Structure formats: C-alpha cells, structure tokens
Amino acid sequence: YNDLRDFLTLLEQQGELKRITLPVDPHLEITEIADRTLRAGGPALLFENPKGYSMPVLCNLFGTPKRVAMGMGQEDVSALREVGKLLAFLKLNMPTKRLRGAPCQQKIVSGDDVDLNRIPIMTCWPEDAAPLITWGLTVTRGPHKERQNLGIYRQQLIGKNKLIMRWLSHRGGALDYQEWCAAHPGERFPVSVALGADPATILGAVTPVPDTLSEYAFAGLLRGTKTEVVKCISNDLEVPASAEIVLEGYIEQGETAPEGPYGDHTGYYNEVDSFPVFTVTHITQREDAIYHSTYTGRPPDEPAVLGVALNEVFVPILQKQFPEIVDFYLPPEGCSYRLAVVTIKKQYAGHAKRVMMGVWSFLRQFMYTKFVIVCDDDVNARDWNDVIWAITTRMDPARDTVLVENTPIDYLDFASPVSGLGSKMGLDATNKWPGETQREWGRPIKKDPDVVAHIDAIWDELAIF
Amino acid sequence: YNDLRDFLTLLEQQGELKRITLPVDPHLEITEIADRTLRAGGPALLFENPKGYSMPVLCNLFGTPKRVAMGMGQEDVSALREVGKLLAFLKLNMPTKRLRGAPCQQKIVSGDDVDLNRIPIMTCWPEDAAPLITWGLTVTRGPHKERQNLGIYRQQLIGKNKLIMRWLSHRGGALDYQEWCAAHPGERFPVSVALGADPATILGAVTPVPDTLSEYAFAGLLRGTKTEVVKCISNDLEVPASAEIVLEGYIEQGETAPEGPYGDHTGYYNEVDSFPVFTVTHITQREDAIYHSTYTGRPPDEPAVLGVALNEVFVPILQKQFPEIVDFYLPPEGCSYRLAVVTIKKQYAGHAKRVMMGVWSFLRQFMYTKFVIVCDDDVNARDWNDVIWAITTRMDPARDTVLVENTPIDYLDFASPVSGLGSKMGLDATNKWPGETQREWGRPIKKDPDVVAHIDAIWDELAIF
Ligand SMILES: Cc1cc2c3c(c1C)C(C)(C)CC=[N+]3c1c([nH]c(=O)[nH]c1=O)N2C[C@H](O)[C@H](O)[C@H](O)COP(=O)(O)O
Ligand SMILES: Cc1cc2c3c(c1C)C(C)(C)CC=[N+]3c1c([nH]c(=O)[nH]c1=O)N2C[C@H](O)[C@H](O)[C@H](O)COP(=O)(O)O
Ligand SMILES: [Mn+2]
Ligand SMILES: [Mn+2]
Ligand code: NA
Ligand code: NA
C-alpha cells in the first residue's frame, strides 16, 4: 500500500524529486522557485529547511503530466484515457477500509494548544491577504446521505485556530453545509481536512466524479485496493490513514470572514468576498510530518497541469457521445477551461456547429468555455502552428464564426458585461463542403506515412539535437 | 405468443377495431377514410372488401397513442418512459428463436408467378406516382457483422416483380447495401420485407436502437419473450414467423429507378429522385393473409402519432443527461421533429441557452430541429395556451432569441436556402433573473394544489360535459 512517502521515494529514484537544503522562506520565495521549476518542466521539490519552521514543505508534486500519470500507478499520460472509460461506466463500488490506528494520529494537539502558526503555510503572491492552505482535502458529509465528498478548497489563515473555507457554491462541501443548515438549524457543521494523503486519494479528490459517489471509492479503483482510512477523533468523518497532517473542527453557523484578495489561476487577484469560518479544534500528524502545498497564478501552474492530464480522462467520454471527435484539448494558456480546440472527422455540411453545441452543453466542466475552435483531423489540436494555419486558411471570419449571447459565465470572469452572464464564440475552421461555399476548395498537403515512419526509425541515429 | 391477429382480437374486444364491409378502393379512398378517422381519434380499421382484391387491408393500427402503448403490452402511454430507461442501459441481449416452420410460408409463389398486382397496395394522394408499400419491415445484413437491421422504407410499385427501395442514406439498410457493394463488387444484395408482423416487432423496427443492435432483440425486451423467426426461403435472413406476407429478393448492383413524386409527412410532395430497385423473387404468405398499410401526409398521420409516443421514450434519456428538464415535447403540427418545446427548473442566469444547445447536439433525432422554445416548469409544454402565454410575457424578442446559421438541415426541407444547410432559432421564454434584466419581474399566478385536488375528486359528479 503506497502512501505518499513511498511515492516520494519512487520519484527520487527517477530524478523527479529534488531536496533543497538552503534556507527558503514560505513567504513568497518558495512560489518563485517552484514557478521557475515548473515552467522549465523540472522535478517535484522538497524544501527541507523552510526559514522559521521544522516541517519540510513539498510542492510542485504534480508539475509535469508524467508525474500525474505516475501518481495513478500508470507509466505514462496516454493511460489516462483508460481511466476515462472507467469513469464513463459509473454513470458495487468499493467502500473504505477503516483501520483501528494510523500514522496521521501519532502526534495530537487540541483546544487551546492548536496553533496553525507552527505549520509552514505559504504566502504565494505579494498582495495576497495572508498565508493560504492550498492542498487540503476537505472531507464532509451532508445530512441526507452517507457519501463522504472530498474537495480542494483554499483556506486563508485568520487566527491560531481559524481558517476561511473558500468553497464555491456548486462544490460538494458547500452543498453539504447548506443542507445541514436547513436540516439542523444552529448546529455546528463537522469538517476535517487531510494534508498529504497518498496520490491516488489526492487525484481522486480532484477528478470530477458524480456527487452521488465518494471520491474515496474512485481512488480505490485507480489504486486497485481499498482506500485505507481512520475515524477522526472529534467526529464521524474518515480521513486517509497515511495523511501527513489532519485538521479537525467545525463551521459555526452564520460565522463568516472577508476572504482575500488572493491571486488566482487566471493570473489576476480575486477581490475580497465573505466565506464560512472553519474553527480548528484538533491537529493530528505523523512523526516527521511533511507539509504539502502549492500555488495558483498565471498559467501554467500545478493546477493547470493537473487540468491537462484530467482532460485526457474526458476525451473518451466525449468520444462515446460524439464519435466524430478525434481530439479535444483545453490549452493551459486559456486559464485551463476558457478555450477548447476540437478536431473531427467531418461527415456533412454544418457538422462543426453540432460539435460546438455539444462542447457547450454535454458536460458541465465545459459549460463555461467561451471560445471553441473546430478543425478537421489533419490538424494537431495541440500545436498552435496547425490551429492558426486552419483558422487562417479555412475560415471567412464573418461566415464561419458563431456568437451566442446571454450564456452562463463564471461569476469571477470580470471580462463579461455582467457577473454570471456573457457571450461565447465558436470558430468553424473545418474545410467547407458544397453548400457551405461555392468555390473550389484547396487540396491540402498530406505527408507520405512511409516517409514519416522511416524518419522516426533513423531519428535518434541522425542525432540532430 | 401474441402475433398480430391476437392483437386485432384484443382491439376488437375493446372497441378499438372496426371492420368495413362496404366496397372501398385502395386507390385514394382508404386514405380519405383513415384520415377522417385518425383526426377524430377513432379506431383501427380493417377493410374486409377492398374493390378488386381478396386480401383485407388493415390501416390506422397505431392512430392513437393508446394503441401504441397497447402494442407494447402496456396499459397506457405513461409506461413508455420505462421502456425509455431500458433503452438508456443498452448504451446479454436476446437472440431470435428460429422455428422450423411458420404460418407466413403457408402459400408460396416464385419466379414468373410473382405478381405484386394481386396485393391491395394503396395509392395515397392524387398526384402520387404509383401504388406504394408503406408498412414493410425491410430486413438486411451488412457484410461486416451478423446484426439484422429492420427498417421501414417506402416502396413504389414499378412492375409485377419490382419495387423501388427508398431508404435515405443514414438508414441501416442503405449502409448495409453500400458496404456490400464495396466489399463484394457486382454481387446481388439479398433483401427481405415482412408485412404484418406482431406489434412488438413493428414498434421495435421504428424505435431508434443503436445500429450495433438488432431491432429483433429490442422487440424481445418489449415482449418479454424472444422474437420468433423463420429462415427465408431464398436467403439467410430471418423474418418474423407470424408475418402475414413476406417479400424476398435482391437488389441488383447499379439498377435504379426514378422514385415518386410522393406526398410526404410534411404535407408536400417530394419531387422525383433515383433509388435502388428491389427485385422480388418470392412472395410468401398466410392462409387468409391481411395486408397492413398506412399513409403519410399533412400531419397528424399515423407516423406522427407513432412519433409522439416514441418521444415519451426519449424524455428519460434526455433527463438523465439534463436533470433540469421536466418535459420535452415535439408537437405533431411541426412535422413531428421540426419544433420542440422544453420545460426546465431553471437554476442560473443563461440556463435556457445550455438547454437549447443540448437539444441541438445530444441526440441525433433532434440534430435537425429548427425551432426550440424553452420555458419554466409552470408551463405545460403540451398546451399552446401556456406556451404562447410564456413567449408573450417572458420574452423581449431581440434579447431572448438565439439564431445560428449554417447548421445541418434535412436535405428535403425546401425552406432552407441551400439543400442540407440552414439556420435554427431558439426562443428563451424563461423568467429572467437579475443579470438578464434590470426590471422587477412579475410574480406569476399559481393555483392552490388543494383546490385543484378537490375539483379532480368531484369533477365526474359535477357532470359538466
Ligand atoms: C487542485 C486544486 C483545486 C482547487 C483549488 C486549488 C487546487 C490546488 C487551490 C487551493 C490551489 C486554489 C483553488 N482551489 C479551489 C478549488 N475549488 C474551489 O471551489 N475553491 C478553491 O479555492 N479547486 C477545485 C476543486 O478542488 C475541484 O474542482 C474539485 O474536483 C471539487 O470537488 P467537488 O466537486 O466534490 O466539490
Ligand atoms: C413508420 C414509418 C417510418 C418511415 C416511413 C414510413 C413509416 C410508416 C412510410 C412508409 C409511411 C413513409 C416514410 N417512411 C420512411 C422512413 N425512413 C426512410 O429512410 N424512408 C422512408 O420512406 N421512415 C422511418 C424509418 O422507418 C425509421 O426511422 C426507422 O427507425 C429507421 O431504422 P434504421 O435506423 O434501422 O434504418
Ligand atoms: Mn465530489
Ligand atoms: Mn436499426
Ligand atoms: Na471533489
Ligand atoms: Na430501424
């Protein structure tokens, strides 16, 4: 049973983990180092000597797509499509195996002894309001079913034992809380947060499984074995037995705090807003605990890289519905969800428009995607040289652009005319068939596949780089 | 095992079948009578004395939605949603049970003895080219899989032993033929057509199951028992053992004939066009054979009524994908597929636009639907009094209308600017939320559910009608 430490050893053996012994400040400096590292596609980083703390800080864990694949037990990034077919089928799944004891409860501190200032919580960007917890798996139950939701919600430090719980309203945690308030007026909402669980559990948290299903069950499928958990000390929620640190407590109904500003995955600061306060009554941890953290900012960042790997999971699901789709890609540069490029085997005049409408309606992850570019299958969706070529040689802008107004848009997207509402643009860059054009369309240059294959074979021997 | 005769007895016992003993001409007159009957919601009709023939003609079999439900073994039309959930799951299924002999091969005629003029084939409308077979289950195999497709394709009489096979190019039969031609150049394509099978087999033929699956297998699920078949005499295709009449033969590669004009479900004539010729080498039938027929024309007609019952099947499938959908209805007046009304529990600004795009992209049956009206759940989608009310009180036409151009359109829709290509219109008639409008929206009048329930209870006793 691989916990997180086993994963770090695996990475270190493969030159995918680097230990920093120099003094480095959790205030701003770690983010700067990790940002350079990620942008050059370097290793995961373990800062063994954070200025002013004894607990090492692990970050950039999932800063390459390879390391996301490795964290699901697979060799490479193409294996992620198979986990996508699996995800199709859930739309008996395996419960958790509850241990009687666990390393994450070796050292326990509670009540007045709780001090989150002892943890090397990072400050990411210069005008961020305060230190911010960024890799917490938040565990909740609602009042109406047994299912335990795991989510990643950022958490601002506001006291020795107070965090802000910044879940957006469509998240599992926020729905569970909202229902608890209606169904049990005035009663404290139990909550627990696990830091540094095994990678299958972490990636399971972030994969959008149904709300009906526990993210613990999915992680079991990725792992091949049941997720090992332990009952929390102060509530009936279960947390991963291998966790490095666990926070337990509750949300007092009505209690809220102004959150942020914080730099966001779009590369801008979110302005201040109110969210629930999470009161921390217990902090449990391993001997030798490692603090797992990250940051978001201008893309690409670790979330963006996670998001590119998880898009591979969705390709199969889309292809099941739309078998004409050859590839489907959401570039990191587009803030991970705002632009999609789709390639198809076009079969009839107008086909591109059906595909756009499918991207905008089929799955909710893409409901808010404001640019969609559709191309033929001779275009590599992942290369702007091909995509721009297609746009500039197969479109007449006014004929081939679809605009739709008053559509749902992310409420934090300041570029839309009104919060929550905006337009979308679809670019039909497919070759135009009779009916779509009265001109003689051009015959595109295709490569000889035998020449390509021969050059693949002798490429290393050629030794050009 | 209910064959068709058992179904007719069931109908007759319930006042849903009427026998006509007066002389009535298959040329034009039967259509006129059936049209009046259907438009007044009357029974199925068995003309025992067709002028100039000895074989009775059965028509308007499925001219009420009730009779469609009855033909699936169910009591009423609401049960069709359950067959819809079933249809969701197929996306072991049961093979056919092959009998050693069958009533449909009691009287056999072949080669030079084949005369389709002995059958009371109907002429539907005054300017139709020729008599037309309208309720044939066409059975085919492709060369690449075992699966037997059943489809209903209209067939013009052009000789003693020649029919035109008018399958549109996306039908199972037409794809099977097309592949046969590529895979076995110049070889005759075996084909067989069953007239008057049991109602589960007929409705199975017309339900859009996957191309992967045999329509015979679905009929088995509707029935509860395997579809009983018999091997054809002249090929390896299987036809329903209970069939009243079966035509066997082949399509000679390259041989085509000008088809029509024929009046169509839109209420207009299709102009002439070429289709493959089906050469009939055998005609098998029961003692006492009954000829099953119908017509299409200005809606509503039997196809339209079939189509309304089968839309009930799709509601669940749509709801699985889009749980906000409360109801989804394609009125017969809109030529059965050209306009849809959808009602939703609206949950956010812009929601109607996601739903429109789903209707236009999720299922292929609705890819060609050119008007979509979206309303809230206080509107009965099936009552133009509600729908027009919603349109006229909740829309500003220019703000709330979505137009999209150069989308796929049915090639026979003469109203589009170019064959196969046209625009679509979505009307967002939902209540507008903040963001969508800066005005104070109106509070709609809701009825007291206790008053409604009380009036349901005393309604018969009130005896107003
Ligand atoms: C990986 C990751 C995902 C974050 C995230 C972060 C990371 C590292 C941070 C901490 C660096 C900064 C932004 N975080 C938030 C977030 N979702 C959210 O509602 N609030 C957030 O603050 N997301 C997304 C959220 O965790 C995922 O969408 C989950 O799949 C939601 O699960 P649920 O649908 O069960 O609630
Ligand atoms: C019930 C019914 C369906 C007709 C039909 C008729 C009826 C009575 C007629 C005979 C009265 C006049 C129009 N017919 C045609 C037709 N489809 C087609 O390609 N050509 C047709 O001529 N349809 C539709 C076709 O039979 C159904 O769409 C099948 O589900 C197609 O099956 P497939 O997808 O397996 O080919
Ligand atoms: Mn979840
Ligand atoms: Mn079929
Ligand atoms: Na989650
Ligand atoms: Na069919």
Q: How far apart are CA B348 and CA A154, in angstroms?
A: 24
Q: Closest approach of chain B CAs to the CA of A373, in angstroms?
A: 16
Q: Which ligand is nearest to the CA of B210?
A: 4
Are B384 and A439 a contacting pair, CB within 8 Å?
Answer: no
DSSP A366: G
Are B94 and B226 a contacting pair, CB within 8 Å?
Answer: yes
Q: How far apart are CA A80 and CA A61, in angstroms?
A: 18
Q: How far apart are CA A414 and CA B200, in angstroms?
A: 57
Q: Report helix, strand or coil for A161.
A: coil
Assign domain A314-431 to a CATH class: alpha beta
Residues in a beta bridge with B375: B343
Provide the residue ranges of all domains of chain B, joining segments of one domain with +: 1-313, 314-431, 432-465
Name the residue with the closest Cα to ligand 2, atom 27.
B206
Q: How far apart are CA B60 and CA B54, in angstroms?
A: 20
Burial B291-303 (b: 16+ CB within 10 A, else e): bbbbbbbbbbbbb
Q: How far apart are CA A444 and CA A222, in angstroms?
A: 42
Name the residue with the closest Cα to ligand 2, atom 30.
B206
Comparing alpha-carbon positions, the chain A residue that sits nearest to B405 is A402
Which residues are found with C-beta within 5 Å of the ion, ligand 3? A 149, 172
Cα-based angle B199, B302, B135 (whole degrees, multiple of 5): 55
Total count of residues recorded for chain A: 465
Name the strand (E) or helix (H) holding A428.
strand A421-428
Are B420 and B411 a contacting pair, CB within 8 Å?
Answer: yes
Structure tokens at B3: 């064959």
- Name every residue whose Cβ is closer than 8 Å to that of residue A280 and which is 6 or more positions away in sequence: A114, A116, A161, A162, A163, A247, A248, A249
Q: How far apart are CA A36 and CA A20, in angstroms?
A: 14
B380 touching chain A per CB within 8 A: no
Most ligand 1 atoms within 8 A of CB, residue of A123, A137, A152, A278 to mutate: A152
Identity of the residue numbered A178 = Q
Residues of A annotated as catalytic are 264
What technique was this entry resolved by?
X-ray
Q: How far is the CA of B230 from the CAs of A209, B114, B124, B239, B241, in angstroms?
A: 47, 21, 32, 6, 5
Q: Which among A53, A58, A46, A44 is positioned nearest to A25, based on CA atoms?
A: A53
Rounded-to-10 torsion of CA A13, A14, A20, A24: -130
Are B175 and B211 a contacting pair, CB within 8 Å?
Answer: yes
DSSP A364: G
Cα-based angle A304, A309, A314 (whole degrees, multiple of 5): 110
**Residues that constitute the known binding site of B for Mn(2+):** 149, 215
Q: In what order do the strands lie in the sheet with A238-240?
A: A97-99, A228-231, A238-240
Q: How far apart are CA A291 and CA B313, in angstroms?
A: 54
Residues in a beta bridge with B166: B154
Chain-chain contact of A367 with B351 (C-beta, under 8 angstroms): no
Query: Between B362, B399, B409, which is nearest A362 by CB?
Result: B362
- Answer whether B292 contacts ligand 2 (Cβ < 6 A): no
CA atoms within 13 A on the CB side of B68: 25
B358 touching chain A per CB within 8 A: yes
| Ligand 4: centre distance to CA B195 (Å) | 17
Q: How far apart are CA B334 and CA B373, in angstroms?
A: 13
Q: Report helix, strand or coil for A355.
A: helix
Q: Report helix, strand or coil for A151.
A: strand
Q: How far apart are CA B377 and CA B379, in angstroms?
A: 5
Name the residue with the closest Cα to ligand 1, atom 28.
A206
Pairing relation of β-strands B238-240 and B228-231? antiparallel
| Ligand 1: centre distance to CA A152 (Å) | 4
Are B332 and B299 a contacting pair, CB within 8 Å?
Answer: yes
DSSP A434: B
Q: How far apart are CA B26 and CA A308, in angstroms?
A: 65
Are B107 and B15 a contacting pair, CB within 8 Å?
Answer: no
Are B301 and B269 a contacting pair, CB within 8 Å?
Answer: no
Whether cis (ω within 30° of 0) applies to the bond prior to A261 is yes
Q: Report helix, strand or coil for A443.
A: coil
Q: Which among A289, A297, A238 is positioned nearest to A96, based on CA atoms?
A: A238
DSSP A65: H
Structure tokens at B398: 């220019």
Measured between beta carbons, the chain A residues lying within 8 angstroms of B421 are: 349-350, 435-436
Are B134 and B154 a contacting pair, CB within 8 Å?
Answer: yes
Structure tokens at A93: 């799944």
Chain-chain contact of B360 with A355 (C-beta, under 8 angstroms): no
Pairing relation of β-strands A44-47 and A17-20? parallel
Chain-chain contact of B436 with A421 (C-beta, under 8 angstroms): yes
Pairing relation of β-strands B148-152 and B136-141? antiparallel
| Ligand 4: centre distance to CA B146 (Å) | 13
Structure tokens at A382: 């992942």
Q: How far is the CA of B310 from the CAs of A60, A126, B224, B330, in angstroms?
A: 54, 61, 19, 10
- Name every residue whose Cβ is closer than 8 Å to that of residue A150 and which is 6 or more positions away in sequence: A137, A138, A139, A172, A201, A204, A205, A214, A215, A216
Q: How far apart are CA B121 and CA B46, in angstroms?
A: 14
Resolution (A): 2.7
Structure tokens at B287: 């003692």
Q: What is the largest CA-CA distance in chain B?
A: 79
Structure tokens at B233: 């005499």
Q: Which among A59, A430, A441 is positioned nearest to B408, based on CA atoms?
A: A430
Measured between beta carbons, the chain B residues lying within 8 angstroms of A321 are: 362
Name the strand (E) or helix (H) holding A450.
helix A449-462
Q: How far apart are CA B241 and CA B254, in angstroms?
A: 32
Residues in a beta bridge with B189: B251
Total count of residues recorded for chain B: 465
Are A408 and A368 a contacting pair, CB within 8 Å?
Answer: yes
Query: Between A351, A362, A419, which is nearest B435 by CB?
Result: A419
Backbone angles phi, psi at B114, to 5 degrees: -65, 120
Q: How far apart are CA A99 and CA A215, in angstroms?
A: 18
Write a three-state SS string for chain B: CCCHHHHHHHHHHCCCEEEECCCECCECHHHHHHHHHHHCCCCEEEECCECCCCCCEEECCCCCHHHHHHHCCCCCHHHHHHHHHHHHHCCCCCCCEEECCCHHHCEEEEHHHCCHHHCCCEECCCCCCCCEECCEEEEEECCCCCCEEEEECEEEEEECCEEECECCCCCHHHHHHHHHHHHCCCCCEEEEEEECCCHHHHHHHHCCCCCCCCHHHHHHHHHCCCCEEEECCCCCCEEECCCCEEEEEEEEEEEEEEECCEECCCCCEECCEEEEEEEEEEEEECCCCCEECCCCCCCCCHHHHHHHHHHHHHHHHHHHHCCCEEEEECCHHHCCCCEEEEEECCCCCCHHHHHHHHHHHCCHHHCCCCEEEEEECCCCCCCHHHHHHHHHHHCCHHHHEEEEEEEECCCCCCCCCECCEEEEEEEECCCCCECCECCCCCCCCCCCHHHHHHHHHHHHHHCCC
